[PDB]
Amino acid sequence: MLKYIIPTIMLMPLTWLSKNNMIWVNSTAHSLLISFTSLLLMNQFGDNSLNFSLLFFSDSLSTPLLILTMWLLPLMLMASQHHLSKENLTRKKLFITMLISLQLFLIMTFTAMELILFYILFEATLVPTLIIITRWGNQTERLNAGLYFLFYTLAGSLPLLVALIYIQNTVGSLNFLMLQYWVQPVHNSWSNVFMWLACMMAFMVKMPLYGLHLWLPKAHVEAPIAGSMVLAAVLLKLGGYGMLRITLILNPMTDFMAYPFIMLSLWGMIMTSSICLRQTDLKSLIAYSSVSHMALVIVAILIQTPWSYMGATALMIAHGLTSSMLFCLANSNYERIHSRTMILARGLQTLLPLMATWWLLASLTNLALPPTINLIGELFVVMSTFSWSNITIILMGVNMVITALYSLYMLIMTQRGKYTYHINNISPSFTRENALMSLHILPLLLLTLNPKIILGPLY
Amino acid sequence: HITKDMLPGPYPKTPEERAAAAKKYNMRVEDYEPYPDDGTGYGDYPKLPDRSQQERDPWYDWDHPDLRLNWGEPMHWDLDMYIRNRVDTSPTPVNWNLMCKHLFGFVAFMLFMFWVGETYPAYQPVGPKQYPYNNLYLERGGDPNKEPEPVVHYEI
Amino acid sequence: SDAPPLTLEGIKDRVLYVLKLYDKIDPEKLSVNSHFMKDLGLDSLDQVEIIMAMEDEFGFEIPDIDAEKLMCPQEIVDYIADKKDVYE
Amino acid sequence: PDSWDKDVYPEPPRRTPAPSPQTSLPNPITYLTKAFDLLVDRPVTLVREFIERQHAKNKYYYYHREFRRVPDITECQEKDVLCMFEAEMQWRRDYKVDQEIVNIIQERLKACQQREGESHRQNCAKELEQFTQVVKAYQDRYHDLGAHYSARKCLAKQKQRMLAERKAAKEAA
Amino acid sequence: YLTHQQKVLRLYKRALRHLESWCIHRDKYRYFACLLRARFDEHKNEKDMVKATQLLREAEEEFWHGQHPQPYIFPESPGGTSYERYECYKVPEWCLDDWHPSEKAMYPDYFAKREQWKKLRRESWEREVKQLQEETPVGGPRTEALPPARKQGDLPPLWWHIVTRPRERPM
Amino acid sequence: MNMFSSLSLVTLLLLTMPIMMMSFNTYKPSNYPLYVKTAISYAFITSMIPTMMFIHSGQELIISNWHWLTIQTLKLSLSFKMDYFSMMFIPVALFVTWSIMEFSMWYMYSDPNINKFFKYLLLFLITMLILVTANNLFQLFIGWEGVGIMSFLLIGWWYGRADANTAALQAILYNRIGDIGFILAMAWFLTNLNTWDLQQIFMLNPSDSNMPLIGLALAATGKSAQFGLHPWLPSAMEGPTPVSALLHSSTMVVAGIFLLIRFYPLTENNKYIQSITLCLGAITTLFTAMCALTQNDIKKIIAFSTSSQLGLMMVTIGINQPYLAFLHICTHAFFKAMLFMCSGSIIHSLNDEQDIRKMGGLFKAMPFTTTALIVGSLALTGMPFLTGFYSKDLIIEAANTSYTNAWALLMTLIATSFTAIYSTRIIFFALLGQPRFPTLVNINENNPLLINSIKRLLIGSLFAGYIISNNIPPTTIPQMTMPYYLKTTALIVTILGFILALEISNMTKNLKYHYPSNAFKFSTLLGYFPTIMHRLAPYMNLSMSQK
């Protein structure tokens, strides 16, 4: 796994030693190049995962998230340069460096062979994000939302540290491969009930979970387009990774502890979908929309059915590709009207023909149009709930409906409408803007041709 | 680059504070009044009519005839939901309760009458479409090992 | 629908020919610029009927506010010519 | 699909009736069918042979890997990665093979239903009944496990099932 | 506002249309139309403001249960068959600027005159500001009516888009 | 065999070749509009070669031509189900599409995006054909959505018109709701059963299939616009007439019933589905006509006029008539779609006028239009030996001569006469009486292209429906024996509708003032189901969302 870590590092001198005007190109050229080598990680095996050394390893589940992250760095740069053109030379190198490190932590995160090492990198991954969101934020309203991240450490990380340590002392090791064979039946006790909360509450907040989501709508409202993409495309997906792996040792306790979590989503999905119809912001509408899809994953992981895991893998993938594109698509308008309000500009299909083609294209797969992977996973999970419980179909049906209702509305409100008379800076779509969307939509469909690469490890 | 004072704020509990809010959104002091002071916390925003956009005249040459909204006008707290696309509260053609109860009649009428017909359906006074071979026990895949009860529908 | 062209000269009689069947007017006294109230000795209530005929004649509604002021045939032509953007 | 054996894929014979036309008009389908041999089939076959011939000059083969049996989980020790690993992969691979046998059998049912058509019910006693046998064994072995299947769990379920019927069997006598 | 005198008309013309759709047939329409106008002429000579004020309540309370179940509406007017059906094709004029050079090379002549059209959109702008400051009451302008240009060569302020507003049929 | 299967799959791929030419290359602009039509023209021929072989051989072929996916003990493929319905329903759809194909090449000359217009018309056709030919629920599901989405754009072609945006989402809202049962059905066949291939589903013959079928019942509730989820179907008439002609008259609306037919072996034994479906059509089949007796919109009336025909189709399935109901699908499509096109002729000469009360004097001023208007109506009303009568007389056989609910047969005939009632109210204003259109005359239909379009679609109803009956092979025991009045009750009540409406129509000539009536408005205002359920329900979901 070193063959991808060092060249990722090597971008840092390239980001710095490079000439003045080739800073963007050089990283873009190689960053795209590295992802090509990333595809090599698809050498999975039917019975065994891929174990390089004691420090990194990637199974079938890990790789698809790895490809998305590496595939996503160049796309983040493309959108970035428009708003950074005015910034001075030194800072751009600073911002670009954080992404390179952000990718470095991520790629090492999902490939980590030892849980604590994963725990360490998990905490590290946040640090670049906070700078990016804060240092180059889009607002100055001082929301004072620190308590949420303080709450994260209090109810999340910090408890997780103790439980991880406790397991090692008791079981004798935290190497996931060892855990496969030394996993012990976790009987019922008040201590274990406390241990269980330590292994999961940390990942629930990041997904996020309904009720615990207050940071996400306000995190995107301020994070720049460069910061937003990784957050919803990668950072949200960290929790599922650990939750899928960590849940290896929480049985049978999870058989009843999941219900308060399951109910939060099952009902959480509808609540978020409805509010989006009321939202007054392109990004915020996507925010809760993000909570919607992530809610489905939580249910899949907890029930731990062979189909749940398969469907969960694509939902993170498709949503990551979906929302990431939506932010870029939404941020395309921001490049003209410099606003997040959804009603300030309307009828843009009258002036941005090819832009609307993406809008219609992206929205189609947002609501899980068949046979796209957006629906393969989402439709995979819906069936699994039926064996767990037949009643669940009511909420999934309602959620899909409303998710189909607001998804087309946002498209309807903006593109299908009458142009704003006073607006007078709707310039034609630039090559960069259209190119960025195209890189998103295209592979999203291609994977539909071959589903065997994001089916998860159960396949 | 907008002043703090010209933004939604607390509930004004005295007319003197209410003077700004009405003025703030270009609503004369008479037309202005906010939600009751409670935990609802909707701020010093006004209480505009619960009406849709289609009700407003389109013949006027608005800045935004699409929305039938003029620049500088206030917006209903849920004016987004009252837009032409969304819920419309234009005058209705027929009486409200009767309109709702006009639906109630026909739909409620039919459901039970089916159950009335279910007890006494309609048919023809003829016997079964007789079949050979043990009432098609074997044609329906019936187990050959265990023969069915003999069936012979005699002539007449 | 092939082409439904519109010409001001052709439209000229369409507005005026509407008056040519009125039973409250002498056709010859009427003129292209004649004011209805004074030159034609008519009234607003009578003027309402003329405005209506244009909607059956041409097929497009007329606002209440602007219907009244169209006391001159040229103005009525202007309303029809200007609303449909006909200039020749 | 170079050469698939038919024993695994049963196929009752096709008995196409010999037409016995009695009408006083020419058969229309014949006009097209002959064009199929000359205008479709052979040109579909003429390019193929030109393609085939080179593959005869250039040759190379491939095998079908064969995994030797290894000690099963009952031969492994508690907290012993070496022995446990060798059984787990064996258990995984063998079970993964058992996954297809349901699909292969399912494929037979898809044959006895469409080729036979309206004689589905009486002409699939062997296939339909043999369908259940696969369901019984496969379902018992590797169902109700959960997402994290493992040789210990399946052995536990087999230990669960063997003990369950043990009491009942002795219960009779 | 608008006075009740004009409010009489707003039911005179509208009531006919629902009657018109009810009439359907041409001979019926004129005859029934004469019936309605005859009723109007029952009180058309009534000059009592109290009664004329009071002779409109019932009419509105009378028409409600006579209004058409499916009243007719003209095509191009709001709610009609061609209600903004072609707004999706109408294109703003101000977007002319962003036209690519090669694209503009197809119509060299038309764009040449526009520069003069915009020319008087710029030079005339300054005096257009003052042109309202003699017809500008204190306390905000009383109405939205506008004056013409009281000279030669200029144009009434606040005119650019309406004069340059697209045509009814883009195609 | 090889020839039969091979030539069959060409249509689906052949139709898609022009689409592949829209995303690529710029070789020849200005000729695509004809390009697509000829492909259907060519496609029809390749859609008739299977017709000959199928009838002679009855070779129902299920072709699995890929191994797409595989889960534990599942397998998905891009397969097709070459069988009776595809071989017999495809030719009609192309025939209608072929007529509509050249119809749209003239009407939409006013659209610069005409080339875009065809970029989607050919798309929908592809999805619909894939739907019917689908051998599995998933692949079948794909078409269930393609028709849903392709409708969205085609419904809302003129995105400016608020009616399009509201109506387009109204249907999408309903269309999605129907899928809830669809996704439910897959789950049940996946939990209790284990596959989504019809081979295993039918052979296993489920013993308790109430739940899976209940989802199927819902599937047709909104997609086919049955009552309870009906209102959207008329809403489609806020957009292009040619768009309404194919999607919402002949091709998409048939989806709801089709699934029940495609699952005929399962639907037979469970009568719980039959009753509600039988009653569902019963309430709808009259509620459509009962509403339609006094509606006053040419395009919407046709929609309601189509609605009742669709509403009755459920009753036809509700009476357990698998292959007899199928005929009503093809038979209705021909003229009704032609009526849309005929309504196009009226709207053309009228220069964008649609009120039924603004039409008349067209018997000789519109000679060709008048020509085909009666045949569809007479065929629609059940004229003997015509395309619509065969189903109308045949379908009423079992319902009135087999075990059925007492109330089910009640609305069965009450609306049956109403079927002809609005037709007379239509042909009256449409053709009878002196002209009532605006002063200027824009009447001109000496357009050879449309005459070709009318020619092709005028013939089929007269003769094709008759021809279709002969070739199809036996699959049922026809109930040729029954009381003469029951066999002729349709032959008795049929003339009543014309006369009864004629009694209603002509008495309105007299110069007598009118009088309001509640029922005159309850049916006219659509029973208040849309006027109410499309205000509060949006308000409930949205006004309550913020809390």
Place this chain on the structure above:
Amino acid sequence: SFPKYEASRLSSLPTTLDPAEYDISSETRKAQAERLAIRSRLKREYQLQYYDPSRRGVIEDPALVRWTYARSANIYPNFRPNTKTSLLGALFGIGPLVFWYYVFKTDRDRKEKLIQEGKLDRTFNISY
């Protein structure tokens, strides 16, 4: 006769039946004129930017911002121990959740025993 329509939230009254507007006195004349001039001044104030060639951008509406600003109400209003809405409002958001707690749980508890006794059908069930 002609029973006057009952005014409802979803049905605004017809314009020519409200008794307020039939008589237009100073109590109405004064208000009507003030709004027009106020509306006119906004139009005049907006009319400059709309018809000024110099502008190249999107007008920063002050009405829109406040409307958007008021939507994002986070902590500024409302009091924690306000029994009128806190207890009942909190129910709309925590009430129905527990309702589902028993719904699915009861079936699964119900379902499990049947499997333990074979009272439920799974013979051809694999996907789980």
Place this chain on the structure above:
Amino acid sequence: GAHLARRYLGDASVEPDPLRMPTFPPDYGFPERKEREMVATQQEMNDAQLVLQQRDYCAHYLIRFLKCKRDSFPNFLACKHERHDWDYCEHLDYVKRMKEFERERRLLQRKKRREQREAD
């Protein structure tokens, strides 16, 4: 429905229940009933590829209808006469269906008078 009306609006017992019909012994005073033969045995029906509902006693005629039809291709107006042989044979069965019912109807009506005097 005269039969529907007379059953319930009249005495319910007299009319045999259509679903349970037949409900009385086959030999309730009905001697020496000739058997109803089957021309086409199990083999022929199986190879005929016919819907079970399409299979009955009269179906042995139904085989003749299509045999000409298959060779009739492309034309279709060559096997018309053969159809009536099966249809008329089907026509007879419908009357039999009507005749089968009455033997159940008569017994219920006749038995009423016998029992009425048994306790009058």
